[PDB]
């Protein structure tokens, strides 16, 4: 939440270089809050499809209920953090984290109204201009996301302000140092939705993942295609396995994350988001071993079209060279080191600084 | 802009008192008007205020119940009554306002800019 | 309400001398007190508002400091004309308080 005040009467005429400043601040100011009310007035395919605010927006319609305000701003009246409990019955973190209201009826409308809308020190112009500007950055983010922005800006929260969060959030201590420090990625995996301008607040539900499953074994798999060698042009027979991704151990199944592109790598850990998986049995894991074994059938496509590329793994990079492609590897110190024959090969990310696969 | 009020006089011990305050040369619309009242030997003390343009007034919670500040727009007057009077009101009442030009909704007397002459109010039979 | 201590009850000084007076509230007020002069038998003069600023023809050597719960007002070259009893007061919320004042006078 953001305590706002409702500016009345804006009765400050005269064209005074240090009045005209405070005036057309002001108006900045009253046009925000203005114009934030106006807002409310391969295998990839097999993925099912969720409403991902759903449980973000679902919180902010128990807001517009009545009275449901008065709770969030008595509760957060002493402190800037306090646990609400809502009406339907869901315990919240309230958090309020910029006072415009205080400062624009204590301490800047005091002084500009002394001297007949004049002010004669130029830091009070700028201090609240210092304090305006967060809100109106709000304002326009939200104004060109349509009320909901991904990932959490920091003018939404400040890095501060969300270890706070995190530290007064209900879940493990392994959780709150797994998100406290990647709070670039739990911004990126965040939502914050805008929700209601009522009394004078302006509040904004945002959306947190929570990561119930950490530090188990995960593995992404790379595939390419497999061809003959046949010398006739339109001989040839391709096969590749489809089952690309990332996998990770979870709750004595594997989940199955076919976009490897949603998932996010700092270091050694995978960031996913179970919402894009797939669950599958632990048996999955013997298509590494033993693409025939009898006790899953795993997944491949088949063509005639005998084309080249490569796929960069983790450490080092798959090359399918086939027809009159020159396929080759380099290193910076060297020149080639290594030409490819035809058929799907592999090298190692140690003497290898490049692959050059036709003109790629 | 020039504050005048009412003249000093005795009231009987029991009764009530109105002091007059006339904003001369200007709208009451544009103040906090405040009355501060002061008793012999003693520092100020804070009666209440009204704010004209909010349709707003506030009284200090020693006073609310037997004080009634009223601005009469149509004469630039503000007035004060004072209902039953015993030995510790007698005192010097001011009338004193606060520019409120631009108001919030939300806005409270905050201090005391421009006075009156004040009244002296004397409780005595 | 909200009580200010105001510190000393009176004091004497030369003329020349710098001069510094104390208000301490009962709880947090930000910077919200303002000070006010009051010669004997006249309404006050508001010095001091927002805990700093200098009223308009209000002679440069007064100012104000402090913030929180403590504050100080400070005359820089005390001069004749000062003589007079000095009240601070708070608005951070109703109802509004005055301290008990400060009598400043002379030696000579």
């Known amino acids: 939440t953001i305590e706002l005040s409702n500016i009345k009467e804006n009765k400050c005429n005269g064209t005074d270089a240090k009045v005209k400043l405070i005036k057309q601040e002001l108006d900045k100011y009253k046009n925000a809050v203005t114009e934030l009310q106006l807002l409310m007035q391969f295998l990839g395919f097999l993925l099912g499809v969720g409403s991902a605010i759903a449980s973000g927006v679902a919180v902010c319609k128990v807001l517009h209920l009545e009275g449901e305000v008065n709770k969030i701003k008595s509760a957060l009246l002493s402190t800037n953090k306090a646990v609400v409990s809502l009406s339907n019955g869901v315990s919240v973190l309230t958090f309020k984290v910029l006072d415009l209201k205080n400062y624009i009826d204590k301490q800047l409308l005091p002084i500009l109204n002394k001297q007949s809308c004049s002010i004669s020190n130029i830091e009070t112009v700028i201090e609240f201009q210092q304090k305006n500007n967060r809100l109106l950055e709000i304002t326009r983010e939200f104004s060109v996301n349509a009320g909901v922005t991904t990932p959490v800006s920091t003018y939404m929260l400040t890095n501060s302000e969300l270890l706070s969060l995190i530290n007064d959030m209900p879940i493990t201590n392994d959780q709150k140092k797994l998100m406290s420090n990647n709070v670039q990625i739990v911004r990126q995996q965040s939502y914050s939705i805008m929700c209601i301008i009522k009394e004078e607040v302006l509040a904004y539900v945002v959306q947190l993942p929570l990561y119930g499953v950490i530090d188990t074994p995960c593995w992404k798999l790379h595939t390419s295609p497999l061809c003959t060698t046949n010398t006739k042009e339109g001989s040839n027979i391709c096969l590749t396995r489809t089952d690309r991704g990332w996998y990770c151990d979870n709750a004595g199944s594997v989940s199955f994350f076919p976009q490897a592109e949603t998932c996010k790598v700092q270091s050694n850990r995978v960031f996913c988001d179970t919402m894009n998986s797939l669950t599958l049995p632990s048996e999955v894991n013997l298509c590494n071993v033993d693409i025939f074994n009898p006790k899953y059938d795993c997944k491949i496509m088949t063509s005639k079209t005998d084309v080249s590329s490569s796929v960069i793994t983790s450490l080092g990079a798959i090359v399918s060279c086939y027809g009159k492609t020159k396929c080759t590897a380099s290193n910076k110190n060297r020149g080639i080191i290594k030409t490819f024959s035809n058929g799907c090969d592999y090298v190692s990310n140690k003497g290898v600084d490049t692959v050059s696969v036709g003109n790629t | 802009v020039q504050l005048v009020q009412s003249g000093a006089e005795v009231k009987k011990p029991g009764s009530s008192v109105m002091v007059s305050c006339q904003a001369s040369?200007?709208?009451?619309?544009?103040?906090?008007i405040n009355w501060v009242r002061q008793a012999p030997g003693q520092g100020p003390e804070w009666m209440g205020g009204?704010?004209?343009?909010?349709?707003?007034?506030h009284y200090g919670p020693k006073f609310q119940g037997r004080v009634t500040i009223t601005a009469d727009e149509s004469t630039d007057t503000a007035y004060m009554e004072l209902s039953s009077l015993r030995s510790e009101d007698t005192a010097m009442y001011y009338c004193?306002?606060?520019?409120?030009?631009?108001?919030?909704?939300?806005?409270?007397?905050?201090?005391?800019?421009?006075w009156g002459q004040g009244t002296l109010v004397t409780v005595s039979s | 309400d909200i009580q200010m201590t105001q510190s000393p009850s009176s004091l004497s000084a030369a003329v020349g001398d710098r001069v510094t007076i104390t208000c301490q509230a009962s709880?947090?007020?930000?910077?919200?007190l303002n000070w006010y002069q009051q010669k004997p038998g006249k309404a006050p003069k508001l010095l001091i508002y927002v805990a700093s600023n200098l009223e308009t023809g209000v002679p440069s050597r007064f100012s104000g400091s402090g913030s929180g719960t403590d504050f100080s007002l400070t005359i820089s070259s005390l001069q004749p004309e000062d003589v007079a009893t000095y009240y601070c007061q708070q608005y951070d919320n109703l109802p509004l308080t005055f301290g008990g004042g400060t009598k400043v006078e002379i030696k000579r």
């Open positions: 040369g200007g709208l009451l619309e544009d103040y906090i």
């Open positions: 004193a306002t606060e520019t409120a030009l631009v108001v919030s909704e939300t806005y409270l007397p905050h201090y005391f800019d421009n």
């Open positions: 009204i704010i004209p343009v909010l349709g707003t007034v």
């Open positions: 709880q947090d007020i930000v910077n919200y």
